[PDB]
Symmetry: C3
Subunit: 405 residues, 3 copies
Amino acid sequence: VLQKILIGLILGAIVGLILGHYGYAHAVHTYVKPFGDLFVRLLKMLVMPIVFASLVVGAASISPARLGRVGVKIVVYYLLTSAFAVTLGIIMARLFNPGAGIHLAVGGQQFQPHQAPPLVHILLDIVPTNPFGALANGQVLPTIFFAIILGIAITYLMNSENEKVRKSAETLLDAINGLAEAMYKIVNGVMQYAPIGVFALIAYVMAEQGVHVVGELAKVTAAVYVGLTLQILLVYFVLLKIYGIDPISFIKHAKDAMLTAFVTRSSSGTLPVTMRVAKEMGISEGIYSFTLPLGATINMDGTALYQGVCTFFIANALGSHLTVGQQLTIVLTAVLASIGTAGVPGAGAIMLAMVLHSVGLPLTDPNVAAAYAMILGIDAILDMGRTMVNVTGDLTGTAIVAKTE
Amino acid sequence: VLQKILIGLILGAIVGLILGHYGYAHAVHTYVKPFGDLFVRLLKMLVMPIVFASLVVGAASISPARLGRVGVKIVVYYLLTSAFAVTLGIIMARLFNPGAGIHLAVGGQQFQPHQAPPLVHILLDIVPTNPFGALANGQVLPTIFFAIILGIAITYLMNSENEKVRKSAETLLDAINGLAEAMYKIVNGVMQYAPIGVFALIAYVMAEQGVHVVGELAKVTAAVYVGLTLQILLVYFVLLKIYGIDPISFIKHAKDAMLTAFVTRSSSGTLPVTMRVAKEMGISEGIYSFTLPLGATINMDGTALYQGVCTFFIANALGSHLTVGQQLTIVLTAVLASIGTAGVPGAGAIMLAMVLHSVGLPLTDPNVAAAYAMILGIDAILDMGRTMVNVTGDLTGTAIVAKTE
Amino acid sequence: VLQKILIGLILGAIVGLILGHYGYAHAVHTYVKPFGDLFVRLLKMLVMPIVFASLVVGAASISPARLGRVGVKIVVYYLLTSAFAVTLGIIMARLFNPGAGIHLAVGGQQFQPHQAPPLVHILLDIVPTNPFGALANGQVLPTIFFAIILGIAITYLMNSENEKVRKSAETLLDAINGLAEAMYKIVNGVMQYAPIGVFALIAYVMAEQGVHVVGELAKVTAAVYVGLTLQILLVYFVLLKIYGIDPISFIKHAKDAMLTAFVTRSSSGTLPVTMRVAKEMGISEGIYSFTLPLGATINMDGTALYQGVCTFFIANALGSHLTVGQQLTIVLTAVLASIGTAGVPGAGAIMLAMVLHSVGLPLTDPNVAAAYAMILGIDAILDMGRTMVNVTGDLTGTAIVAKTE
């Protein structure tokens, strides 16, 4: 499996890259990308039962602390891993270069989605209004919430005086587990397609946007991937070791999701695999159940590091000192944008504006707008990497709060 | 419990009221309404499983009569309680006078709701086309219907020749009961937040519309509340007592629903609590499972009483003789719009036009428009009261048909 | 039933027919059609749970072959039965004649549906993106797919070394079967309404379009019906008989679905009755569970026949030679459109264009557009017949792939 995917990944990225230089970009998109979609598709499909079932059951564990404790632990873990990652980006963007060379074609045309939901209508939006609707619409947040409340609820019912009560409660709680179980059985079968999918998936990415990783972009591309590489070593290997956990047992188990998350670019779409991985490394369904999903949307260290290295790239190709010292605002805003950024195909660059405006350079004065347009050119490239470091870091922390609680 | 809420209630009312007389209305809203929202959120959530689950189970009771009997009983009980209520509000509107004080500013703007669905595509719309969708979209009517057809079906399945058919039936039927059971477990938990919720809720209501209970409205305001008051004494207590049931054990057990319905204003959103109260006083799940939901949308004695007093208020501020003798039309159309009115936040005043134009005064002729416009200024206040009489009345007739059948 | 359904259909088709010849069409439509709608509503209701549940369960049978084998078989079966039907239409439309009587009214108006989703965005669209969304949205295909994958997934879970895995698996698998079981109990119940519905339903159709089946249209009408009849004897009996299964016993056991489908016109909405008929003749729930739905959208021998007799009707009123020899284009295109045509109210006529344009005469050349607009007059008439030969042949194919595999 891991060799058939790697065989696919490598020979793919190569087969792609050739065609992009021979001008077959469009022809890879009309013939190859679908085979790679059937994969992204066949994954998205498991996201909803798997997440749901494996968390109502996931209130197996001790309500008050376990969950509550595990939560407070991984939330603090998430925030720090995020904040650090942008700092490591901020620096990486100094060492390796963004780009001082002047951006040509002024006026790229970048729209203003200022109608950005008020923070209150987001936090309040975390409580479902129809667990069923929320359930049948994606919405892997309220769905998380309702699962927990339903789980905790089921647990209490089993400690009841009545024999009736605890019986029907265990019928349901079992049935829900049937699903939970049945779902992984699938994540496995539909993982076998991953080779073809992976190959076909990058065949597009490279033959469409790789054939442009040159100029100052090449510097940035590299300025990001190196920044990324370090985030794994300097942060995940470093925090794993001190936490009594084997870095090679880690990055060999999670070697499955690690890749899916890189070819798909959908952190959220990778969730079924990410969750099989956590399960297939013996973590309690009370941890990986409320950590990976809550994290498949909060912890985006990779995106944050990317947001840092990108604030400088526009600050350079614009001509500011990046408000030296007050680039701790970037450190902050990029942590705030991390949370927000949604784990869909490629919306980190979109949610990158909030940070850009915080350093002082809005997406409207067409110098900033036309420089941004260049970043968006090398984005299928940039994302892959960060959308790994995004899923990896969520496991790193599941593995921590694993041993811990 | 009832005290923690009562403390919050009275104290909130005062806190609000004062802030509204100092000009802090927009600050309560931006700050305090969300705590009251989180409450309504947390309830709206349980509305869908609770209704579904506790009704498939609800087909424990004897298919033919019980349901078929209890049904026809509670509809007659409902229609009359609604008719009585508007008559009682017409009386209450002649005695306590609405207001012959000539309408002020001419320019209210009220578009015509003529596109009010045909009765055909309303009755037929009671049969769901996708129980799963009807299930996952609110729609607590077709959902009611399916639940019963599912139950009754699960009932026949147990009396089967095969032991497998009867086994699986009892699996499902049980699992379903898990949810239902589990869902009340939450009604009790989420009930604990209510004090903070309640306080936060009226805090807004009063410091936004309470600080406007003046002019002719103050009369109408009171003209309505005194009517509502009687509707509890003269009808509910009187019809409770006569059927061999204790009015004080009633208002003692149903104290919870009554209040949540008063602050929420959501008759429908109060359904979980209301349904716990029904079970928390021993009505069989074969009755409160099909009376309260079907009642949270048909029986709205309060709205009809509020719809009575309000047709006159415009007949007074317009100079119409309230079409003496032919005000039996209000009596009818209000019983007809009662039904129609949906237990959402505040649509009694909207569904009022059906009754208004039936009396002769159309919502288009600027005089009526500008009359209506004032009533709608003091609505949060006006609604709270009738929202109570609305939930209350559903319990009353469920308590009647409790003893009867 | 059987005779009350027949008594309703016969007297109804007449009661209708009469009112039309006197001018009351619209009245039949305001008072009668609703009863015949409450039937179609009461069927459509069970198409979603009956389909899903009777197929997760339907992964009773041997994963590898059985399914796969059964699958490859029915598809070849369908593709041949379809292709034959049209050929049988072409012929039937050469012997019986469309019309050499020149189209009159030029000025009918037909908007070009050039936006016809690509075959790729249809085939990838067969895999759900949220089984729950697709569950709650019709989508009796994505849902078919996810069922099989959750069924097969559950089977393996049952042969698990753990006892926990195999317990919760059989709890779930049972709960699902409960519904599947319950859902047939209903199809029986709401099948009793059938005579009322049937009666009311042809009452409309006849008294609104029957009183128009005259002239070259009456010829066409007969040409399509004589053609359909022949598709039944010459292909269904003659293909049942050869495969060793009694025709009279087949067209006796499926006289139920056979009729609902003729009065409903919705092959898709008839499904629950079609599935009960399958079960009630003893086909394994692992065949009729994945042959009938994946047939209520792909196998439409009826539509296809009607598509050949129509492509001929136009090239006659228009005066072409129907591209003689190359009407095997139609033969092909029709089978291709048959698949596409989806078993809803009356859209075979809509999807007819693709065949027409392939033959040569597009729907926008105001001549063709006016011939076609006549065909669309006697449509629910033509539809009834082909919406039978449509379902009938979806069983015939399950009756073969029953015996064989």
